[PDB]
Amino acid sequence: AECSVDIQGNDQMQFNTNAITVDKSCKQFTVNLSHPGNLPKNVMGHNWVLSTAADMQGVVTDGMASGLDKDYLKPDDSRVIAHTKLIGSGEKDSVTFDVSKLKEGEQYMFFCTFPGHSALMKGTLTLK
Template sequence: MTIKMKNATAMLLTTLLAGPALAATCDVEIEANDAMQFNKSSIAVPASCKQFTVKLKHVGKLPKTAMGHNWVLSKAADAQGVAADGMAAGVDKAYVKAGDARVIAHTKVIGGGEADAVAFDVAKLKAGEAYAWFCSFPGHSSLMKGTLALAK
């Protein structure tokens, strides 16, 4: 085998192996714990995705009545109002005001050892817009929050 053939074979192999790694990932896993923390602070949503799924897992042990968590997405400018209205909505409505048009997506409230997921239409996001996600369980949104952006 010539050096050119070896190089070409190596390049082809590298390209084939890297292919799946370069594909857009249209989901993310986020963990919440009993210390009122998420394990991520930002999410980049590939513009090539049609749907994006957030998988929330509560890795703590406390029940949802004591240390429940959810994941709520809105425009950053709307986050404080969404969180305040969510607290008033109560646990039966997952601390999200019914019919709140400012909410792009949200999970249910989960307790220790539980998980939930939500998928949303990426077309609802606009490039350059600032989005925030947070836990709307009363008192949690000031610590449990992050940013989301539409990536190119």
């Protein structure tokens, strides 16, 4: 019944959530990302990126290949459903997207595209 979720990305290269369930009653969903850490954006930058579980690997690979000058996300990557900007220590960013971009029974994954972060910074998302 809640169409938003507060998520944190810290200096331990960890998100504080492993799973997110988007309620069908929601026409839109909001992700409020914050960085409670103290490490510089260049060494511990975090973002919240959503894609199907199948597309995660490709998005992550082409993301790091795009460098910091692109918030580690390939421009016009159709595989990306939604994303927050790349934030550093003490910062916050929110993104709201149309839930109609998701379908029941499909596996989605949220993750950080900063090089190497997705090893720990990834979780599941489903429409239910």
